[PDB]
């Protein structure tokens, strides 16, 4: 079984052509055809708005304060008895994420990979820079990748990952507990909608 968690962490909840971004992300998930269930994971404060809108549709769980609290809590609920085989975690602001991408992630989990991110080559030269604005070096662009969501995991791994802490990107948790994570093509359409420019692009895209 496959369950996606869309954590609410305002932005995810802003409007885009008659739908909040998080509604669209959730739909992009359901329509992938490979996702059985979406939990929306929201802090207490936003449980009313989350219910009116995403009213199942999806499971709602609420809520910690941090993003990681609400993912943790959601992890707690996906539980044991009805525990799914795989769990995706998807950024609500990646509202235009293509279903194929989604399926491409699930297919890799189905193929043994316990952890999987969608990834794109970098379009700009990348430099490492210090606090005083001085270039520290220019790492090789090949070798480096930009990563998107949804990120997919065997739920056992992601549970474990999260439990470790204390002591953003979910895969970096896995990476921290020494899990190995694998890569699949992303899609520019899956950009995080963060700015007016972002929005502008999102707008132009939906009504094309």
């Amino acid at each position: 079984e496959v369950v996606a968690i869309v954590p609410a962490a305002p932005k995810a909840f802003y409007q885009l052509d008659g739908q909040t971004l998080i509604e669209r992300a959730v739909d992009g998930l359901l329509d992938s055809g490979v996702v059985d269930t979406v939990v929306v994971a929201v802090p207490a404060d936003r449980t009313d708005e989350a219910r009116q809108i995403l009213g199942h549709r999806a499971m709602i769980v609420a809520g910690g304060s941090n993003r990681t609290d609400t993912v943790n809590l959601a992890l707690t609920v996906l539980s044991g008895t009805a525990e799914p085989e795989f769990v995706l975690v998807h950024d609500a602001a990646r509202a235009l994420t293509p279903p194929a991408l989604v399926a491409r992630v699930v297919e890799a989990l189905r193929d043994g990979y316990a952890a999987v991110v969608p990834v794109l080559p970098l379009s700009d030269t990348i430099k490492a820079v210090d606090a005083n604005g001085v270039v520290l070096g220019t790492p090789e662009r090949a070798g480096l990748r930009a990563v998107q969501t949804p990120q997919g995991f065997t739920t056992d791994l992601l549970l474990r990952s999260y439990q470790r802490g204390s002591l953003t990107d979910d895969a970096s948790l896995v990476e921290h507990i020494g899990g190995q994570v694998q890569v699949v093509d992303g899609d520019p359409l899956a950009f995080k909608i963060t700015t007016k420019l972002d929005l502008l692009l999102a707008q132009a895209i939906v009504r094309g």
Copy 2:
């Protein structure tokens, strides 16, 4: 001390973003900054004549070369007396004039090599040849570099003794300083950029 700008473009240059080719937009942005005195556009020899018809008094045109670095030497070679040289990517047609002023300003403040740069929307990861994540260099202050990149001519010249100019300057030992870029300065490449470009240019 004069400020010159080179636009190595040797088919992005001539692509017509609703009514103006990107080369003309790139050239205007450099001009509107108010601190660029000369622009040299390098294009393939086949297109040398046509690029003149487009740009007129705005840019002296020179013929290109095989790769990029190759032409830049040539473009460079032409002049043959500026103090600062900017190199700019014509694919960044919607660069704001301010960003260029910000680059020119840093040069006048002593820094011999300046580049505009931006924080990164997505998490960057290091990935090996098999698609296995090596790690997340979140602590390295990674940055997305833009153009125009600016140098003292003297420094840019020594450097020419892979499309990122500043790399050579770091390669001869020279230190490069950063200023803030601007997302408007993005590189128009993918179909999505084209759409982004349109949305903006006609907003």
